[PDB]
Amino acid sequence: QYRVGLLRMERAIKERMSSVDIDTVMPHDLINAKPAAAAVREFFGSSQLSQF
């Protein structure tokens, strides 16, 4: 599930890096963190394996 979240984050970073230039760019400014923690939250929030 973290690999799925990382694939989503990679898609987001690929969609966002085309707009923001890489030369003189603020570090880690295009990498998102919502789908990273959202995947583990769903895994521990309402997953069938983490049900109880």
Partner 1 sequence: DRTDDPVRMYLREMGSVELLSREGEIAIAKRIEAGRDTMIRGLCESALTFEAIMVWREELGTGRILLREVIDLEGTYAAIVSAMEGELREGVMAILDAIASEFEAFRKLQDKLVGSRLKGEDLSDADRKAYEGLSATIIQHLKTLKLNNNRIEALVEQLYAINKRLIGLEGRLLRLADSYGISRGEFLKAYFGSELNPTWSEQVKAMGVRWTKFVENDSQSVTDIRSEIAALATETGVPIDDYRRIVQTVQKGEREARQAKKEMVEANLRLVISIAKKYTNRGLQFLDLIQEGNIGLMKAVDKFEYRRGYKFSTYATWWIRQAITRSIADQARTIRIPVHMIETINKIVRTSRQMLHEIGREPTPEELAEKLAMPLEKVRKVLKIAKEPISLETPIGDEEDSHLGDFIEDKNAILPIDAAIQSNLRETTTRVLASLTPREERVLRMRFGIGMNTDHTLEEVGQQFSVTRERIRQIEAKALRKLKHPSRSRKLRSFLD
Q: Which residues bind partner 1 (CB under 8 A)?
A: 15, 28-29, 31-34, 48, 51-52
Give, in order, the Cα–Cα distances in Å from 46 to each of 7, 21, 26, 39.
Answer: 21, 38, 36, 11
Q: Do the Cβ atoms of 39 and 47 come closer than 8 Å? A: no
In the bound complex, what is the minimum distance in angstroms from residue 28's beta carbon to partner 1? 6
In the bound complex, what is the minimum distance in angstroms from residue 51's beta carbon to partner 1? 5
In the bound complex, what is the minimum distance in angstroms from residue 44's beta carbon to partner 1? 16
